[PDB]
Write a protein that binds this ligand. Structure first.
Ligand SMILES: [Cl-]
Ligand SMILES: [Cl-]
Ligand SMILES: [Cl-]
Ligand SMILES: [Cl-]
Ligand SMILES: [Cl-]
Ligand SMILES: [Cl-]
Length: 251
């Protein structure tokens, strides 16, 4: 698990968000090219998802049914496409400003870092009443992940930290990472290990739940890791923004 592979995407331009579904399909926001692409496990040829009207897709998430959710940064909205659909829908968030990260929990609740408005919002599936999560002291939430229990993890880009808030709680905590610099992407695996792209320091780090010892993942040749996803096998996928590529490391 010290051997990185470059995924056989083509034509990427500063990729930003990455997500992986239960079948191992990898989804990437091709942020410089105004499109979202996917690659099935074992395929060497990507496909372009049929989103339309985008103005810079920035983050991506996928739920257990294969529905794909994308932050449309320049349109202040989150769009979704069901598996097998050519008809996108717009989630009824309101008042967003350059949304960046998106996550979806097992109940279908969608969480977005409303990055221009210094807040994190969520919308239960079928709701049109969003809730602002009670994080405090943020300086630009950038990425978001949510674990199996509904605990929410956010990269606080301007405070060089990752904050955590359990469902129902009003009291966040700060995870004991060391020496982060403008962290961007965050992911959490089924063991509760938290993975962060330390975007200002050219590295990807992880922290097991309850640990104070972070480990630096053995990626090589990075030029700004920007987003991170982790599959059910513990394989880690990272957008290497300055190399126009997506790399992965098996557990
Ligand atoms: Cl960016
Ligand atoms: Cl951007
Ligand atoms: Cl940005
Ligand atoms: Cl930012
Ligand atoms: Cl950024
Ligand atoms: Cl960047």
């Amino acid at each position: 698990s010290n051997t990185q592979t470059v995924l056989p995407f083509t034509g990427l331009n500063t990729p930003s968000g990455v997500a992986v579904d239960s079948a191992g399909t990898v989804y990437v926001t091709d942020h410089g090219n105004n499109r979202v692409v996917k690659l099935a496990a074992g395929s060497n040829t990507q496909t372009v998802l049929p989103f339309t009207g985008l103005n810079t897709p920035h983050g991506v998430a996928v739920d257990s049914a294969g529905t794909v959710y994308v932050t449309d940064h320049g349109n202040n909205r989150v769009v979704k496409l069901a598996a097998g659909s050519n008809t996108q829908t717009v989630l009824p968030f309101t008042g967003l400003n350059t949304p960046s990260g998106v996550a979806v929990d097992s109940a279908g609740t969608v969480y977005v870092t409303d990055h221009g408005n210094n807040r994190v919002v969520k919308l239960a599936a079928g709701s049109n009443t969003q809730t602002v999560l009670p994080f405090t002291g943020l300086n630009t939430p950038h990425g978001v992940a949510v674990d199996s229990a509904g605990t929410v993890y956010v990269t606080d880009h301007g405070n060089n930290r990752v904050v955590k808030l359990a469902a129902g709680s009003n009291t966040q905590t700060v995870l004991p990472f060391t020496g982060l610099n403008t962290p961007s992407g965050v992911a959490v695996d089924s063991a509760g290990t938290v993975y962060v792209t330390d975007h200002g320091n050219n590295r990807v780090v992880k922290l097991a739940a309850g640990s104070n010892t972070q480990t630096v993942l053995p990626f090589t040749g990075l030029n700004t890791p920007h987003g991170v996803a982790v599959d059910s096998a513990g394989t880690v996928y990272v957008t290497d923004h300055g190399n126009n590529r997506v790399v992965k490391l098996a557990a």
